[PDB]
Design a protein around this motif. Structure first.
Motif, PDB file in Angstrom:
ATOM      1  N   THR A 152      -4.197  -3.596  -3.392  1.00  0.00           N
ATOM      2  CA  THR A 152      -5.380  -2.748  -3.507  1.00  0.00           C
ATOM      3  C   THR A 152      -6.520  -3.268  -2.635  1.00  0.00           C
ATOM      4  N   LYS A 153      -6.931  -4.513  -2.858  1.00  0.00           N
ATOM      5  CA  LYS A 153      -7.945  -5.133  -2.016  1.00  0.00           C
ATOM      6  C   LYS A 153      -7.419  -5.247  -0.592  1.00  0.00           C
ATOM      7  N   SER A 154      -8.286  -4.999   0.387  1.00  0.00           N
ATOM      8  CA  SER A 154      -7.885  -4.967   1.791  1.00  0.00           C
ATOM      9  C   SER A 154      -8.905  -5.726   2.626  1.00  0.00           C
ATOM     10  N   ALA A 155      -8.651  -7.016   2.844  1.00  0.00           N
ATOM     11  CA  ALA A 155      -9.474  -7.857   3.715  1.00  0.00           C
ATOM     12  C   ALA A 155     -10.951  -7.765   3.338  1.00  0.00           C
ATOM     13  N   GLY A 156     -11.212  -7.851   2.046  1.00  0.00           N
ATOM     14  CA  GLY A 156     -12.534  -7.686   1.491  1.00  0.00           C
ATOM     15  C   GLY A 156     -12.439  -7.021   0.140  1.00  0.00           C
ATOM     16  N   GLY A 157     -13.598  -6.782  -0.467  1.00  0.00           N
ATOM     17  CA  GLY A 157     -13.616  -6.210  -1.798  1.00  0.00           C
ATOM     18  C   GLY A 157     -13.287  -4.738  -1.873  1.00  0.00           C
ATOM     19  N   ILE A 158     -13.183  -4.063  -0.731  1.00  0.00           N
ATOM     20  CA  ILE A 158     -12.975  -2.620  -0.724  1.00  0.00           C
ATOM     21  C   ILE A 158     -11.564  -2.313  -1.206  1.00  0.00           C
ATOM     22  N   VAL A 159     -11.469  -1.574  -2.305  1.00  0.00           N
ATOM     23  CA  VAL A 159     -10.194  -1.169  -2.883  1.00  0.00           C
ATOM     24  C   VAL A 159      -9.742   0.122  -2.218  1.00  0.00           C
ATOM     25  N   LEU A 160      -8.431   0.306  -2.121  1.00  0.00           N
ATOM     26  CA  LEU A 160      -7.846   1.501  -1.526  1.00  0.00           C
ATOM     27  C   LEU A 160      -7.074   2.257  -2.597  1.00  0.00           C
ATOM     28  N   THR A 161      -7.394   3.536  -2.764  1.00  0.00           N
ATOM     29  CA  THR A 161      -6.721   4.400  -3.723  1.00  0.00           C
ATOM     30  C   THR A 161      -6.335   5.698  -3.035  1.00  0.00           C
ATOM     31  N   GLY A 162      -5.085   6.122  -3.225  1.00  0.00           N
ATOM     32  CA  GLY A 162      -4.607   7.381  -2.694  1.00  0.00           C
ATOM     33  C   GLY A 162      -3.580   7.173  -1.593  1.00  0.00           C
ATOM     34  N   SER A 163      -3.647   8.040  -0.584  1.00  0.00           N
ATOM     35  CA  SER A 163      -2.707   7.999   0.528  1.00  0.00           C
ATOM     36  C   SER A 163      -2.963   6.847   1.490  1.00  0.00           C
ATOM     37  N   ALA A 164      -4.170   6.278   1.492  1.00  0.00           N
ATOM     38  CA  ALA A 164      -4.470   5.187   2.413  1.00  0.00           C
ATOM     39  C   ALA A 164      -3.631   3.952   2.106  1.00  0.00           C
ATOM     40  N   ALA A 165      -3.454   3.636   0.825  1.00  0.00           N
ATOM     41  CA  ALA A 165      -2.631   2.500   0.416  1.00  0.00           C
ATOM     42  C   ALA A 165      -1.164   2.898   0.509  1.00  0.00           C
ATOM     43  N   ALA A 166      -0.547   2.624   1.656  1.00  0.00           N
ATOM     44  CA  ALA A 166       0.831   3.018   1.896  1.00  0.00           C
ATOM     45  C   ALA A 166       1.798   2.104   1.149  1.00  0.00           C
ATOM     46  N   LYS A 167       3.049   2.551   1.060  1.00  0.00           N
ATOM     47  CA  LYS A 167       4.073   1.793   0.354  1.00  0.00           C
ATOM     48  C   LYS A 167       4.360   0.482   1.075  1.00  0.00           C
ATOM     49  N   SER A 168       4.695  -0.549   0.301  1.00  0.00           N
ATOM     50  CA  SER A 168       4.927  -1.870   0.869  1.00  0.00           C
ATOM     51  C   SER A 168       6.150  -1.862   1.777  1.00  0.00           C
ATOM     52  N   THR A 169       6.087  -2.657   2.845  1.00  0.00           N
ATOM     53  CA  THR A 169       7.156  -2.764   3.829  1.00  0.00           C
ATOM     54  C   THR A 169       7.835  -4.135   3.754  1.00  0.00           C
ATOM     55  N   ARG A 170       7.599  -4.862   2.665  1.00  0.00           N
ATOM     56  CA  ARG A 170       8.220  -6.154   2.420  1.00  0.00           C
ATOM     57  C   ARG A 170       8.914  -6.116   1.067  1.00  0.00           C
ATOM     58  N   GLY A 171       9.883  -7.005   0.871  1.00  0.00           N
ATOM     59  CA  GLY A 171      10.656  -6.999  -0.356  1.00  0.00           C
ATOM     60  C   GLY A 171      11.289  -8.343  -0.643  1.00  0.00           C
ATOM     61  N   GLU A 172      11.983  -8.399  -1.776  1.00  0.00           N
ATOM     62  CA  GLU A 172      12.697  -9.590  -2.219  1.00  0.00           C
ATOM     63  C   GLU A 172      14.171  -9.253  -2.402  1.00  0.00           C
ATOM     64  N   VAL A 173      15.047 -10.021  -1.753  1.00  0.00           N
ATOM     65  CA  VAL A 173      16.480  -9.773  -1.856  1.00  0.00           C
ATOM     66  C   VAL A 173      16.993 -10.296  -3.192  1.00  0.00           C
ATOM     67  N   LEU A 174      17.753  -9.463  -3.898  1.00  0.00           N
ATOM     68  CA  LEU A 174      18.364  -9.840  -5.165  1.00  0.00           C
ATOM     69  C   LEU A 174      19.838 -10.180  -5.021  1.00  0.00           C
ATOM     70  N   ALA A 175      20.609  -9.319  -4.360  1.00  0.00           N
ATOM     71  CA  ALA A 175      22.033  -9.531  -4.153  1.00  0.00           C
ATOM     72  C   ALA A 175      22.374  -9.286  -2.691  1.00  0.00           C
ATOM     73  N   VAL A 176      23.399  -9.981  -2.207  1.00  0.00           N
ATOM     74  CA  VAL A 176      23.812  -9.921  -0.810  1.00  0.00           C
ATOM     75  C   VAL A 176      25.287  -9.550  -0.760  1.00  0.00           C
ATOM     76  N   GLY A 177      25.630  -8.596   0.101  1.00  0.00           N
ATOM     77  CA  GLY A 177      27.003  -8.152   0.215  1.00  0.00           C
ATOM     78  C   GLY A 177      27.903  -9.186   0.863  1.00  0.00           C
ATOM     79  N   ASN A 178      29.201  -8.875   0.864  1.00  0.00           N
ATOM     80  CA  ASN A 178      30.188  -9.807   1.401  1.00  0.00           C
ATOM     81  C   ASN A 178      30.071  -9.937   2.915  1.00  0.00           C
ATOM     82  N   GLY A 179      29.826  -8.840   3.607  1.00  0.00           N
ATOM     83  CA  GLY A 179      29.662  -8.879   5.047  1.00  0.00           C
ATOM     84  C   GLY A 179      30.278  -7.661   5.698  1.00  0.00           C
TER      85      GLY A 179
END
Lengths: 95, 137, 95, 95
Positions: free
Chosen positions: C18-45
């Motif tokens: 929500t906070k963006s390089a300062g106290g200004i909070v972002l609500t609505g379409s401006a705050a886009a979906k995250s492009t980072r994640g955490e891997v839980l399971a990994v396939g065989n290959g």
């Protein structure tokens, strides 16, 4: 008795859940089709470019998560609706 | 300030009609200093005074199946929860959390919104008589 | 518990900041979906043309940057949203 | 600190030029966004069909000319715009 050919697997979807996370019963477009199924038959394996064949990783009796697309075919076998689908559309195996 | 003088003024102003003055004095006493009184056409041959205490607005139930007292054709809820949604409700998905919380609490719910679309209305009405939640909209 | 097949990886995207390089909070379409994640399971290959398998580079516990697309699928497991997507959609791994 | 996977390279786009071949200053849509960059990290190598890897030709510290397209993606690290793109999108290296 039916068996697929090459890398195809026969699955049957589970019934759509009515109550979700409480007593609230979901009816209408909210109750989407289940994306989990039970594998009934497994093909011999996919044919490689060289000529040899390797067995499919999914085994009979497992529960699988898949995506519905143009490749999934629904057939009314022995008065019981089942899906014939390629192994590439199987995303993960539950447990 | 006395109700007697108010009755006298209402009588004089109505071409010497005692009943009108009495009715207006009674209405002023019942409604209070900060309320409003209105005059409209009746149906019978006599004047009647109907005083509404509290808040009431001219919007009814959105679906007949919400009625839980069919004798009078009315929906009565005891100690309800009120959800004031200043938006259009079309999808039931946004309402699962509050509905689950209300069901856990065990008290009825009333939803005042811009409008309710058929999907959410159908889900709510199905949940009403099933015994899960008591909901009106 | 679920395990992917072949070269697929299961991730959960991080919460949108929500906070963006300062106290200004972002609500609505401006705050886009995250492009980072955490891997839980990994396939065989991935399956090679000859037939042999090669393990994936991402290991369980890493933080990944991925591109959202039509191939990435979201499935509800244990009342929690996760993403099932192929290893080709991973762009880089942080740290 | 992020490292790309396979044949991907992270670059930072050079600032657009305003003073053009003399005193004339350019503002607006005339000043097209720059198509030169600085390579920061290089992936391990592209995966061949047989299984072995081939190291990338671009080395860290070079200046590259790339073609912007749907394959080049922009993402934020340390509050600075950088581009994640495949090594196939690099046309030539300057000097």
């Amino acid at each position: 008795n039916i068996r697929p050919l090459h890398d195809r697997v026969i699955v049957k979807r589970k019934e759509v859940e009515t109550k979700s996370a409480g007593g609230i019963v979901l009816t209408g477009s909210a109750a989407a089709k289940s994306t989990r199924g039970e594998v009934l038959a497994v093909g011999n394996g996919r044919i490689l470019e060289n000529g040899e064949v390797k067995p499919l990783d999914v085994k009979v009796g497992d529960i699988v998560i898949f995506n519905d697309g143009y490749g999934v075919k629904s057939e009314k076998i022995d008065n019981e609706e089942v899906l014939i689908m390629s192994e590439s559309d199987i995303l993960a195996i539950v447990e | 300030s006395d109700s007697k003088a108010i009755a006298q003024v209402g009588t004089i102003s109505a071409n010497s009609d005692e009943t009108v003055g009495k009715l207006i004095a009674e209405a002023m006493d019942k409604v209070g200093k900060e309320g409003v009184i209105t005059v409209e056409d009746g149906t019978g041959l006599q004047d009647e005074l109907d005083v509404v205490e509290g808040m009431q607005f001219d919007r009814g139930y959105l679906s007949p199946y919400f009625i839980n007292k069919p004798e009078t054709g009315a929906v009565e809820l005891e100690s309800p929860f009120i959800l004031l949604a200043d938006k259009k409700i079309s999808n039931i998905r946004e309402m699962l959390p509050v509905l689950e919380a209300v069901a856990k609490a065990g008290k009825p719910l009333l939803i005042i919104a811009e409008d309710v679309e058929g999907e959410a209305l159908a889900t709510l009405v199905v949940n009403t008589m099933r015994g899960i939640v008591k909901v009106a909209a």
